[PDB]
Amino acid sequence: ATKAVCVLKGDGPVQGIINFEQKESNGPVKVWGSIKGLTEGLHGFHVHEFGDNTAGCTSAGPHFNPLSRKHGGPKDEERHVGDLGNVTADKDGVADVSIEDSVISLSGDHCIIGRTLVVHEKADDLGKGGNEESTKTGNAGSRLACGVIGIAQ
Amino acid sequence: ATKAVCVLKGDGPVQGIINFEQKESNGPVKVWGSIKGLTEGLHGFHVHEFGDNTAGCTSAGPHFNPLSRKHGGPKDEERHVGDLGNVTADKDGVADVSIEDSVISLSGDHCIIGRTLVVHEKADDLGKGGNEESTKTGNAGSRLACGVIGIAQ
Ligand SMILES: [Cu+2]
Ligand SMILES: [Cu+2]
Ligand SMILES: [Zn+2]
Ligand SMILES: [Zn+2]
């Protein structure tokens, strides 16, 4: 039973705790928790390559993309490993997160431990948008909060 | 080849950036950087087991100790994998960190990526303090600052 956790913090009001659980080697990873201080609507939700917060969320670099694919949504064959789609915040500015993903892992070459979880300014268009930036970043804009994914008890 | 980084944060502000570099997976790890906001003198400096900062540095748990050994200094055969001894702060409260260690790793069973680096209130006695706590924590007292160790570019 592998477990991981991530504390999301930024320069503004966005703060979250996100938990990961993977029962089996090469089984699905359950992703859950809560993020507050968000604007109502969709916020892009990604694993970025580097667990580097030296200069804040910008230091995490691009989407975690070990297989050199284009950007997409979690349900797409063509996605980055780190493509976890959107979280949705209500009028209270809270996003309840309950995700299962079979592309991320907590071990092996898809391992996300020691990488950065990022929640974004805008919606991720899941690569289905009307421009080139769709198929690199999903046009989710700035990084509102982030943290390094750590091994949990 | 293998690089890692950690941002230390805590009340003071106690603020640090610590870099890790391991050319070879069978090779030593160079650990360098700077921590400010410390009291002049020795501060214990350890890798703790969990990369969990959900409730602060307390969430990181005990020293990283995959081989079930007693606490020691970095030069000791009998040590926790996480035992990196002390950093030393100047009268300006700055600890310049320059450490080479052959027991921590950035891959394999002694991998410290996704675990928590902690700088402590007091000196680590490197397990030579006599009392029972010396053999467990080095009597280094509270956790002033910590962060999760992430993979770096
Ligand atoms: Cu992202
Ligand atoms: Cu410690
Ligand atoms: Zn992507
Ligand atoms: Zn120890």
Author numbering:
A (entry chain A), B (entry chain F): 1 to 153
What does the paper say about this structure?
Mutations in the gene encoding Cu-Zn superoxide dismutase 1 (SOD1) cause a subset of familial amyotrophic lateral sclerosis (fALS) cases. A shared effect of these mutations is that SOD1, which is normally a stable dimer, dissociates into toxic monomers that seed toxic aggregates. A common property of ALS-associated SOD1 mutations is that they increase the propensity of the dissociation of the SOD1 dimer, which promotes misfolding and aggregation of the resulting monomers into cytotoxic species. We postulate that 2 free cysteines situated on adjacent monomers, Cys111a and Cys111b (separate by approximately 9 Å), could be cross-linked to prevent dimer dissociation.
The cyclic thiosulfinate 1,2-dithiane-1-oxide (Sulfur cross-linking 6-membered ring, hereafter S-XL6) and β-lipoic acid (the S-oxo derivative of α-lipoic acid), target the Cys111a and Cys111b residues on adjacent SOD1 monomers, forming a disulfide bond with each cysteine thiolate. The cross-linking reaction proceeds through an initial thiolate-disulfide interchange between a cysteine thiolate and the cyclic thiosulfinate, generating a sulfenic acid intermediate upon opening of the ring structure. This sulfenic acid intermediate forms a cross-link by rapid condensation with a second cysteine thiolate. Specifically, the structure of SOD1 with S-XL6 shows that the linker is attached by S-S bridges to SD atoms of Cys111 and connects 2 monomers. The electron density for carbon atoms of the compound is much weaker than for sulphur atoms, probably due to the flexibility of carbon chain and/or partial opening of the ring structure due to a water-mediated hydrolysis. These water molecules are largely excluded upon the incorporation of S-XL6. Results obtained in NSC-34 cells, specifically the lack of cross-linking in the Cys111Ser variant, indicate that the Cys111 residue is targeted by S-XL6 and is required for cross-linking. We have shown that a cyclic thiosulfinate cross-linker, S-XL6, binds to Cys 111, cross-links monomers, and stabilizes the dimer of SOD1 fALS variants with diverse physicochemical properties and disease severities.
